[PDB]
Design a protein around this nucleic acid. Structure first.
Ligand SMILES: Nc1nc2c(ncn2[C@H]2C[C@H](O)[C@@H](COP(=O)(O)OP(=O)(O)C(F)(F)P(=O)(O)O)O2)c(=O)[nH]1
Ligand SMILES: [Cl-]
Ligand SMILES: [Mg+2]
Ligand code: NA
Ligand code: NA
Ligand code: NA
Length: 326
DNA sequence: CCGAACAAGCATCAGC
DNA sequence: GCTGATGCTT
DNA sequence: TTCGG
């Protein structure tokens, strides 16, 4: 990582703007700059050089100049001394606590891990499980454990119904040597954009993974999206594995390619691609790509039979998953 | 100089 | 109950 | 905060 110092600084600023300032556009600005710099294949010498990259403007260039000169940023040094800022930033590391809840907790004097544990009653269900596994959810998953988790999920799904197809997406499908969590796309032929010929399709899968004690907790769950907690089983007298976040998304079978594009990411890659789509007169979600009419309203779904078809519409050359880690 | 910035599922709350 | 806004999340 | 128009 040639410019690891610059990107870490930009990421820390992004987090500050999101968590503390609640300034989502500054947050996006910093992450996009950190992403474009992370991709830049030279050791950045000056803010003016970085300013040549799209998404690095005048203000970020100045901060890069300060950082390259001193090794630090005064703005961040002050932010780190501010206790309300530091407390808010920290509390948002719990799954289910965002900038609003973090500021509300700090208002009531709840501002440390111990404060949170003292006040479980003050947490909704998601936050409670996020606190329970706070330590574990900060751990990365080695690709070897990802493969074991993959083998479990695909085989249990096959046992519910041989016609399910479960695809692990996220950073795993992008070839990552480690992942932050497990993302599972799910399809079944009974659920298409035309009809739902079978209720409980996601539920049946969740229930089976719970039965075999893979899924241990639920953060949120509806008919198409499950967000929860899982754990690899461990061998005799082995220390147990950390608990892991798992997301399962049931998507209409005929819309698999938009779904797998969405769920493979990265999140910034999706933003950049959907932004380019609009500039090309299309709008992309996890279901369809549609033209924008003269008005501005999306037209009817365009035919898609591959990921590359989506790339073609917006006049991008196909990028393999491993080149979408933006 | 200024407006647009990706898109959406689930939990939660206020209002009716 | 439903509708719609908001928080939080992918 | 950045960009395009
Ligand atoms: N259009 C958007 N798509 C988004 C967004 N966030 C996530 N996603 C998509 C893409 C992720 O890869 C996919 C899974 O979301 P996830 O947060 O698990 O990201 P990744 O798996 O890519 C990862 F961060 F690298 P990890 O640490 O988990 O290994 O969900 C978003 O804000 N907009
Ligand atoms: Cl903002
Ligand atoms: Mg993931
Ligand atoms: Na630039
Ligand atoms: Na959080
Ligand atoms: Na995920």
């Amino acid at each position: 990582t040639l410019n690891g110092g610059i990107t870490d600084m930009l990421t820390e600023l992004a987090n500050f703007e999101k968590n503390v300032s609640q300034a989502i556009h500054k947050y996006n600005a910093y992450r996009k700059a950190a992403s474009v710099i992370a991709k830049y294949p030279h050791k950045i010498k000056s803010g003016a050089e970085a300013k040549k990259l799209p998404g690095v403007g005048t203000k970020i260039a100045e901060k890069i100049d300060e950082f390259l000169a001193t090794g630090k940023l005064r703005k961040l040094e002050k932010i780190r001394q501010d206790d309300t800022s530091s407390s808010i930033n920290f509390l948002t590391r719990v799954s289910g606590i965002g900038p609003s809840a973090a500021r509300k907790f700090v208002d009531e004097g709840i501002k440390t891990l111990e404060d949170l544990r003292k006040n479980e009653d003050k947490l909704n269900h998601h936050q409670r499980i996020g606190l329970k596994y706070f330590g574990d959810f900060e751990k990365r998953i080695p690709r070897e454990e990802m493969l074991q988790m993959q083998d479990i999920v695909l085989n249990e799904v096959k046992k519910v119904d041989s016609e399910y197809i479960a695809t692990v997406c996220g950073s795993f499908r992008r070839g990552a040597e480690s992942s932050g969590d497990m993302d599972v796309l799910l399809t079944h032929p009974s659920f298409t954009s035309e009809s739902t010929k079978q209720p409980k399709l996601l539920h049946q899968v969740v229930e089976q993974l719970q039965k075999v004690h893979f899924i241990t907790d639920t953060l949120s769950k509806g008919e198409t999206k499950f967000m929860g907690v899982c754990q690899l089983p461990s061998k005799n007298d082995e220390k147990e594995y950390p608990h892991r976040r798992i997301d399962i998304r049931l998507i209409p079978k005929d819309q698999y390619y938009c779904g797998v594009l969405y769920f493979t990411g990265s999140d910034i890659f999706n933003k950049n691609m959907r932004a380019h789509a609009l500039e090309m007169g299309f709008t992309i979600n996890e279901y369809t790509i549609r033209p924008l009419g003269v008005t501005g309203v999306a037209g009817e779904p365009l035919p898609v039979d591959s990921e590359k078809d989506i790339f073609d519409y917006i006049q991008w050359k196909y990028r393999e998953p491993k080149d979408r880690s933006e």
